[PDB]
């Protein structure tokens, strides 16, 4: 009772020191030092391909490791794996629970995993000797809707759900070898680092945390946003990440600086961001929106450079190929466009 | 290039077989209607069901396959996983009217569903599920609606009321006041695309499914008239 106030009194005071440490480490804005670089211009982005086989909204997709095969999850019980070059669908995986909210493609190109509101992160095996596609594991240890999951290895799937916690599953036996706690609200999206040694998670409390896959405890906390956190992804360098909230304001954070770098906001937009991803060089920040069309944000100037279109419903997912050759976006219109 | 030619030709046969299966399931998917169910903890949502996170209940009424499911596993927060139900035919909102204290909380939830950006085009079928307890409370007179709803002192039975035989006027005034409290919420922001269908039902009613089939039909029919520039 009384001991809580003294700890709270000291916790606030040392929290101010962190603010002072951040203030002392705040020399000048990134925008001021970067004003002397040449702008990218106006990127002419066109619908090079269209993929139409889904019966309802597409909620997420994940580009394969070969930058050719992509997998899309639509709320119909169908997990369809397309061939981007030839428009063919290699497999049409029938799910058990129709309401799927996430999907992932193995970096080895053998396993595909999905699972949404059913609280189960099913994992499907592709290359089988039986000639069919079956389920390899049924990871069921969460209490709350399962929002996003990205593989780390062929046995190291990392899952983030709606129970304010993230888990590092083990496909071999199916038990959670680590469970990360510390968030206060729903955790929506997470991105793994290029070296896969530490990842981040965006939560529905205007805060992003830095997790460690092996040690298993929170490392850094980032809170400068206004509302929920719908999407998040690392800078390709692996030492930075930018996230999009539901207040129509993308922000870019730097791990070493432990601050907020840029505020990707426009005085007109009032529609929140639903997906963020980078290009192969990190210059182009392609952020989806609720205003029915995407955007291309110059990551080093915070000035919009090019606006995409072609979707008659909101865009929810936006993935970039491994080689950076093309970007594919899926929308709630059941239309998975491939854009180069 | 013979080996290469056998690859893309194999994909076309693979694509043709898959596309045939997909079209077979396309017709089935369009022939089943989804109905999100949500209400209060003691409202009695499972009571209407008289046929994990999601409990599915499929019933076939008048040769039309319905698909009604309840979401119970997830926590109290619902501002993120409710956007997943914007493609359903209707939303079955069952709420109890016996507990007056837990009625204003339900009013905010219905208002929150009504004025939602992605749920603004979803008709809400309203159910009241504890009429037996509602009649007993007002007839007993120990608990007054006035202390929780001061606007009930100046309310009269509407001219369109259809009270059941052998029913006290006090019950009828209480029944329709709550209904007119929900309807005032819906009609204040009804843009003509989504509607409310208030209903009264106790826990022993037998035709709790026909009242949805006779209302999902009206909702879809009103959708076709509006999309033909005809309504």
């Amino acid at each position, epitope marked *: 009772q009384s001991e809580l106030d003294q700890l709270r009194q000291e916790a606030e005071q040392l929290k101010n020191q962190i603010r002072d440490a951040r203030k002392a480490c705040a020399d000048a804005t990134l925008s001021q030092i970067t004003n002397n670089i040449d702008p990218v211009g106006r990127i002419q982005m066109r619908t090079r391909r269209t993929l139409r086989g889904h019966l309802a909204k597409i909620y997420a997709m994940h580009w394969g490791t070969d930058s050719r095969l992509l997998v899309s999850a639509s709320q119909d019980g169908k997990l369809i794996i397309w061939d981007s070059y030839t428009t063919n669908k290699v497999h049409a995986i029938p799910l058990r629970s129709s309401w799927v909210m996430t999907c992932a493609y193995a970096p080895s190109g053998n396993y595909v995993a999905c699972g949404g509101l059913d609280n189960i992160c099913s994992i499907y095996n592709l290359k089988t000797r039986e000639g069919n596609v079956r389920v390899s594991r049924e990871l069921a240890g969460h209490t709350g809707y399962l929002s996003c999951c990205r593989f780390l290895d062929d046995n190291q799937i990392v899952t983030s759900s709606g129970d*304010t916690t993230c888990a590092l599953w083990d496909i071999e036996t199916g038990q959670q070898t680590t469970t990360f706690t510390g968030h*206060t*609200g729903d955790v929506m999206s997470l991105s793994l680092a290029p070296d896969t040694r530490l990842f981040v998670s965006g939560a*529905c*409390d*205007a*805060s992003a945390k830095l997790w460690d896959v092996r040690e298993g405890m929170c490392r850094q906390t980032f*809170t*400068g946003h*206004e*509302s*929920d956190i719908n999407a998040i992804c690392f800078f390709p360098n692996g030492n930075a990440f930018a996230t999009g909230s*539901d*207040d129509a304001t993308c922000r870019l954070f730097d791990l070493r600086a432990d601050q907020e770098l840029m505020t990707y906001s426009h005085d007109n937009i*009032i529609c*929140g961001i639903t997906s963020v991803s980078f290009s192969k060089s990190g210059r182009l920040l392609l952020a989806g929106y609720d205003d029915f069309n995407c955007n291309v944000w110059d990551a080093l100037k915070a000035d919009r450079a090019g606006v995409l279109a072609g979707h008659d419903n909101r865009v929810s997912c936006l993935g970039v190929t491994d080689d950076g050759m093309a970007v594919a976006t899926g929308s709630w219109d059941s239309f998975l466009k491939i854009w180069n | 290039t013979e080996d290469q030619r056998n690859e893309e030709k194999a994909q076309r046969e693979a694509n043709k077989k898959i596309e045939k299966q997909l079209q077979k399931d396309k017709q089935v998917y369009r022939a089943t209607h989804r109905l999100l169910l949500l209400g209060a903890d003691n409202s009695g949502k499972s009571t209407i069901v008289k046929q994990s996170g999601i409990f599915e209940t499929k019933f076939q009424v008048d040769k039309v396959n319905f698909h009604m499911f309840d979401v119970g596993g997830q*926590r*109290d*927060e*619902r*501002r993120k996983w*409710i956007q997943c139900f914007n493609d359903v035919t209707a939303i079955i909102f069952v709420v109890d009217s016996s507990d007056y204290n837990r009625l*204003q*909380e339900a009013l*905010n939830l219905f*208002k*929150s*569903i*009504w*004025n*939602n*950006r992605w749920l603004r085009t979803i008709s809400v079928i309203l159910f009241l599920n504890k009429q037996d307890l509602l009649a007993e409370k007002v007839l007993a007179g120990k608990s007054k609606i006035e*202390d*929780y*709803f*001061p*606007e009930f002192a100046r309310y009269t039975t509407p001219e369109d009321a259809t009270p059941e035989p052998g029913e006290d006027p006090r019950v009828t005034r209480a029944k329709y006041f709550i209904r007119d409290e929900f309807l005032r919420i819906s009609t204040a*922001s009804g843009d003509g695309r989504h509607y409310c269908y208030p209903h009264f039902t106790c826990a022993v009613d037998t035709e709790n499914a026909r009242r949805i089939f006779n209302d999902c039909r009206d909702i879809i029919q009103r959708m076709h008239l509006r999309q033909y520039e005809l309504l």
Partner: nanobody
Amino acid sequence: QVQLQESGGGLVQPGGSLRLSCAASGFTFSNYKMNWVRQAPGKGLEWVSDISQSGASISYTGSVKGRFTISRDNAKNTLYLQMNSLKPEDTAVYYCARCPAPFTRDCFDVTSTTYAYRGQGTQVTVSS
């Protein structure tokens, strides 16, 4: 970081007056439909009143209707709730809840057990 610090009152005899000051910072105050929620001891969370972005649309719960005045000052980034004619059933803790998303007519999932954009709360008790 969004913070909602509150400065209210304590023990007051029934029929008295109290004023609740809700100091807010860290967010654009003008775009958010703040609410007011209370939790009586041994009871759940219940909603009291809400006020729109500009202060035009105001609603109240039935029990607290006709006794409480809610007003916001978008210039100084603060919210007010002035109460008169207290009742023994007003003994509760008050939270100056915010709204999850800007520019939304419906403020959804605000009385949840675990919520993020909600203040610590202050204790308001009436007795002799």
